[PDB]
Write an enzyme that holds these catalytic residues in place. Structure first.
Site, PDB file in Angstrom:
ATOM      1  N   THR B  59     -40.373 -64.159  67.425  1.00 31.55           N
ATOM      2  CA  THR B  59     -40.742 -62.708  66.467  1.00 31.55           C
ATOM      3  C   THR B  59     -42.063 -62.100  66.178  1.00 31.55           C
ATOM      4  OG1 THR B  59     -39.552 -63.823  64.968  1.00 31.55           O
ATOM      5  CG2 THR B  59     -38.291 -62.026  65.286  1.00 31.55           C
ATOM      6  N   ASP B  89     -43.254 -66.511  66.402  1.00 33.53           N
ATOM      7  CA  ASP B  89     -43.952 -67.293  66.824  1.00 33.53           C
ATOM      8  C   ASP B  89     -45.947 -67.515  66.109  1.00 33.53           C
ATOM      9  OD1 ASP B  89     -46.320 -67.705  68.777  1.00 33.53           O
ATOM     10  OD2 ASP B  89     -45.218 -65.427  69.698  1.00 33.53           O
ATOM     11  N   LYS B  91     -47.192 -69.708  64.912  1.00 26.22           N
ATOM     12  CA  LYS B  91     -48.807 -70.543  65.300  1.00 26.22           C
ATOM     13  C   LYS B  91     -49.564 -70.580  63.957  1.00 26.22           C
ATOM     14  CE  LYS B  91     -50.109 -67.985  69.614  1.00 26.22           C
ATOM     15  NZ  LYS B  91     -48.999 -67.024  69.889  1.00 26.22           N
ATOM     16  N   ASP B  94     -53.195 -74.740  60.851  1.00 28.81           N
ATOM     17  CA  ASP B  94     -53.841 -75.268  59.090  1.00 28.81           C
ATOM     18  C   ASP B  94     -53.143 -76.984  58.711  1.00 28.81           C
ATOM     19  OD1 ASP B  94     -55.691 -74.882  56.605  1.00 28.81           O
ATOM     20  OD2 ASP B  94     -54.644 -72.816  56.630  1.00 28.81           O
ATOM     21  N   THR B  98     -51.022 -76.961  53.374  1.00 28.04           N
ATOM     22  CA  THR B  98     -50.990 -75.198  53.957  1.00 28.04           C
ATOM     23  C   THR B  98     -49.301 -75.110  54.722  1.00 28.04           C
ATOM     24  OG1 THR B  98     -53.223 -75.204  53.385  1.00 28.04           O
ATOM     25  CG2 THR B  98     -52.197 -73.572  54.486  1.00 28.04           C
ATOM     26  N   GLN B 207     -55.392 -60.970  77.502  1.00 29.70           N
ATOM     27  CA  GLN B 207     -54.117 -61.747  78.035  1.00 29.70           C
ATOM     28  C   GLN B 207     -54.238 -61.719  80.001  1.00 29.70           C
ATOM     29  OE1 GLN B 207     -51.777 -63.396  78.051  1.00 29.70           O
ATOM     30  NE2 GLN B 207     -49.957 -62.668  77.670  1.00 29.70           N
ATOM     31  N   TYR B 209     -51.375 -62.514  83.185  1.00 31.53           N
ATOM     32  CA  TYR B 209     -50.081 -62.209  83.525  1.00 31.53           C
ATOM     33  C   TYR B 209     -49.574 -62.855  84.980  1.00 31.53           C
ATOM     34  CZ  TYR B 209     -49.295 -59.097  80.378  1.00 31.53           C
ATOM     35  OH  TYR B 209     -49.134 -58.484  78.825  1.00 31.53           O
TER      36      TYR B 209
HETATM   37  O1  16B Z   1     -49.162 -63.852  74.674  1.00 32.30           O
HETATM   38  C1  16B Z   1     -48.953 -65.645  74.058  1.00 32.30           C
HETATM   39  N1  16B Z   1     -49.360 -66.068  74.741  1.00 32.30           N
HETATM   40  C2  16B Z   1     -49.477 -67.809  74.024  1.00 32.30           C
HETATM   41  N2  16B Z   1     -50.212 -68.490  74.460  1.00 32.30           N
HETATM   42  O2  16B Z   1     -50.907 -68.020  76.038  1.00 32.30           O
HETATM   43  C3  16B Z   1     -49.027 -68.314  73.015  1.00 32.30           C
HETATM   44  C4  16B Z   1     -47.740 -66.745  72.694  1.00 32.30           C
HETATM   45  N3  16B Z   1     -48.080 -65.461  73.015  1.00 32.30           N
HETATM   46  C5  16B Z   1     -47.210 -64.763  72.370  1.00 32.30           C
HETATM   47  O3  16B Z   1     -46.419 -63.932  73.878  1.00 32.30           O
HETATM   48  C6  16B Z   1     -46.612 -62.379  73.794  1.00 32.30           C
HETATM   49  C7  16B Z   1     -46.569 -61.593  75.389  1.00 32.30           C
HETATM   50  O4  16B Z   1     -46.895 -60.704  74.837  1.00 32.30           O
HETATM   51  P1  16B Z   1     -46.926 -59.940  76.001  1.00 32.30           P
HETATM   52  O5  16B Z   1     -45.935 -60.587  77.361  1.00 32.30           O
HETATM   53  O6  16B Z   1     -48.389 -59.581  76.819  1.00 32.30           O
HETATM   54  O7  16B Z   1     -46.839 -57.979  75.785  1.00 32.30           O
HETATM   55  C8  16B Z   1     -46.974 -61.820  72.417  1.00 32.30           C
HETATM   56  O8  16B Z   1     -45.883 -61.635  71.035  1.00 32.30           O
HETATM   57  C9  16B Z   1     -47.903 -62.948  72.029  1.00 32.30           C
HETATM   58  O9  16B Z   1     -47.715 -63.242  70.696  1.00 32.30           O
HETATM   59  O1  16B Z   2     -60.859 -73.094  54.338  1.00 33.79           O
HETATM   60  C1  16B Z   2     -60.306 -73.724  55.350  1.00 33.79           C
HETATM   61  N1  16B Z   2     -60.688 -74.168  56.848  1.00 33.79           N
HETATM   62  C2  16B Z   2     -60.103 -74.953  57.022  1.00 33.79           C
HETATM   63  N2  16B Z   2     -60.290 -75.546  58.545  1.00 33.79           N
HETATM   64  O2  16B Z   2     -60.935 -76.981  58.234  1.00 33.79           O
HETATM   65  C3  16B Z   2     -58.999 -75.143  57.076  1.00 33.79           C
HETATM   66  C4  16B Z   2     -57.812 -75.033  55.259  1.00 33.79           C
HETATM   67  N3  16B Z   2     -59.160 -74.328  54.774  1.00 33.79           N
HETATM   68  C5  16B Z   2     -59.040 -73.840  53.533  1.00 33.79           C
HETATM   69  O3  16B Z   2     -59.620 -75.175  52.607  1.00 33.79           O
HETATM   70  C6  16B Z   2     -58.191 -75.488  51.013  1.00 33.79           C
HETATM   71  C7  16B Z   2     -59.042 -76.503  50.273  1.00 33.79           C
HETATM   72  O4  16B Z   2     -58.135 -77.017  48.903  1.00 33.79           O
HETATM   73  P1  16B Z   2     -58.482 -78.204  48.455  1.00 33.79           P
HETATM   74  O5  16B Z   2     -60.043 -78.073  47.846  1.00 33.79           O
HETATM   75  O6  16B Z   2     -58.381 -79.645  49.891  1.00 33.79           O
HETATM   76  O7  16B Z   2     -57.239 -78.365  47.453  1.00 33.79           O
HETATM   77  C8  16B Z   2     -57.051 -74.889  51.434  1.00 33.79           C
HETATM   78  O8  16B Z   2     -56.655 -73.093  51.009  1.00 33.79           O
HETATM   79  C9  16B Z   2     -57.116 -74.524  53.286  1.00 33.79           C
HETATM   80  O9  16B Z   2     -55.679 -74.154  53.594  1.00 33.79           O
END
Ligand code: 16B
Ligand code: 16B
Ligand code: CL
Ligand code: CL
Lengths: 256, 256
Positions: B59, B89, B91, B94, B98, B207, B209
């Site tokens: 999802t 999915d 990903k 952070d 967070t 993408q 394939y």
């Molecule tokens: O394409 C991806 N690649 C990834 N790494 O390469 C990880 C997840 N995905 C997810 O895999 C699905 C692939 O979609 P198609 O099969 O490209 O419609 C999508 O929902 C992407 O967000």
């Molecule tokens: O803007 C960002 N960029 C990031 N990349 O380094 C990582 C975290 N953040 C966000 O910056 C905030 C930092 O919070 P604190 O100051 O540690 O309480 C959080 O909401 C993080 O998720």
């Protein structure tokens, strides 16, 4: 070293960067508040009370227990009244076809209200290309994550350099970076740095901290992002003022 | 090469990985449907029609225009009736504090319904540590993104090796990888591969394939993830059966 005001006028400046720079100059603030709260009323109370002290409010809409678009509509009224930009810290990091949908649709409709979003560069430039399809018509900007504040970060070396390149090749939409120091010498790009507190340290679950003087004055960043350093203080107004004065004075020092 | 049934009994094997491997064995499917649709009605109709053909439904909750927890309750019911795992999915990418709220809380409450979630490794092990604090009590599992399918992916070489080592160090929570091929020699880890269609090609946003036979037969991955290859067909049931036969026959062939 140009002032924020002057960088807002650069011929190649993105309109959103220009709008952010003019308001940082006007209000004397280079502080982004990380509004890390779980209730919509907290998020709006903080935006209203701390608005005058900040150039930007950073959200994680997906941690709000009671998100509705009407909360974001009210946030925009506060952003317009007090003059700051809204930065949704979504960290897009999927293929371009998927991020496009994640940015425009679902329940959050992030592009409907966020002036800025950010993305990881690990998928390749497709991540920027899909976001741009949604964000350009809506006059939006994106920040690329060039480095991370956290322990064990892989966003170093060649990876940082790839983020910079990606940003230069997509400057109609990318307005700068999340990074721990200046990573591009081009003054059109903004640098925003999280992991900022007045006192040294300060980990917990991987986070690391540097002071506003260090990251603004020494490392050449533009904007500090602060969450807990303000939000956990007893007096969040005074705390926001302290960080704003620290970051603003460090920026002035750098101009000489 | 061990069969899926036999791998379900590795001693080191996560119970989530075990449940999945047994149902792949039993159903003769190593196909994960990427259910990339924006309406609940369509998501649930595909989950029901294709439930018998798949081992997993993947999802993107944040693209679902009419998301409610009641929709996810219905999805759980079909996952139990038809026997497949739900993989959100998301990903996660952070800092630790967070991602734990992104996983447990907000409007989506991902951990309450998703058997599996995945995370990028760019922030360092803090990302896994945050999720694991939520996921372990709930007996959930996690995939780490070791490689990506998109043009320009920076998930290569040292990055990918960093991902494998992180999975090793957090094996009570990490059940394997999203990658283009086998990245770990350990048979306890699952490898799931997106960027799969019967026809060679790509989309217009980066993408790429490769075929089921290429990714399962020659690259030795375990599970194909397939979105458009199926969702765009007029008859998604026929399409899911084509992909299931292909991936499963390719799996049999690598076994001799
Ligand atoms: O394409 C991806 N690649 C990834 N790494 O390469 C990880 C997840 N995905 C997810 O895999 C699905 C692939 O979609 P198609 O099969 O490209 O419609 C999508 O929902 C992407 O967000
Ligand atoms: O803007 C960002 N960029 C990031 N990349 O380094 C990582 C975290 N953040 C966000 O910056 C905030 C930092 O919070 P604190 O100051 O540690 O309480 C959080 O909401 C993080 O998720
Ligand atoms: Cl720009
Ligand atoms: Cl591309």
């Amino acid at each position: 070293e140009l002032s924020f005001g002057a960088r807002a006028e650069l011929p190649r400046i993105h309109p959103v960067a220009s709008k952010l720079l003019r308001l940082m100059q006007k209000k004397e603030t280079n502080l982004c508040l990380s509004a890390d709260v779980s209730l919509a009323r907290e998020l709006l109370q903080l935006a209203d009370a701390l608005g005058p002290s900040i150039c930007m409010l950073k959200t994680h809409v997906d941690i709000l227990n009671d998100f509705t678009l009407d909360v974001m509509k009210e946030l925009i009224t506060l952003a317009k009244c007090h003059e700051f930009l809204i930065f949704e810290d979504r960290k897009f990091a999927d293929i371009g076809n998927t991020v496009k949908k994640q940015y425009e649709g679902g329940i959050f409709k992030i592009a409907s209200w966020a002036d800025l979003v950010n993305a990881h560069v690990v998928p390749g430039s497709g991540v920027v290309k899909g976001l741009q399809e949604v964000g350009l018509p809506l006059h939006r900007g994106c920040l690329l994550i060039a480095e991370m504040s956290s322990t064990g970060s892989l966003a170093t070396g060649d990876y940082t350099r790839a983020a910079v390149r990606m940003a230069e090749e997509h400057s109609e939409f990318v307005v700068g970076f999340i990074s721990g120091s200046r990573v591009s010498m081009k003054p059109e790009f903004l640098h925003l740095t999280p992991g900022v507190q007045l006192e040294a340290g300060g980990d917990n679950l991987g986070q690391q901290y540097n002071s506003p003087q260090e990251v603004i004055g020494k490392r050449g960043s533009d904007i500090i992002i602060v969450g807990r350093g303000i939000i956990s203080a007893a007096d969040r107004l005074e705390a926001a003022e302290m960080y704003r004065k620290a970051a603003w004075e460090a920026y002035l020092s750098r101009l000489g």
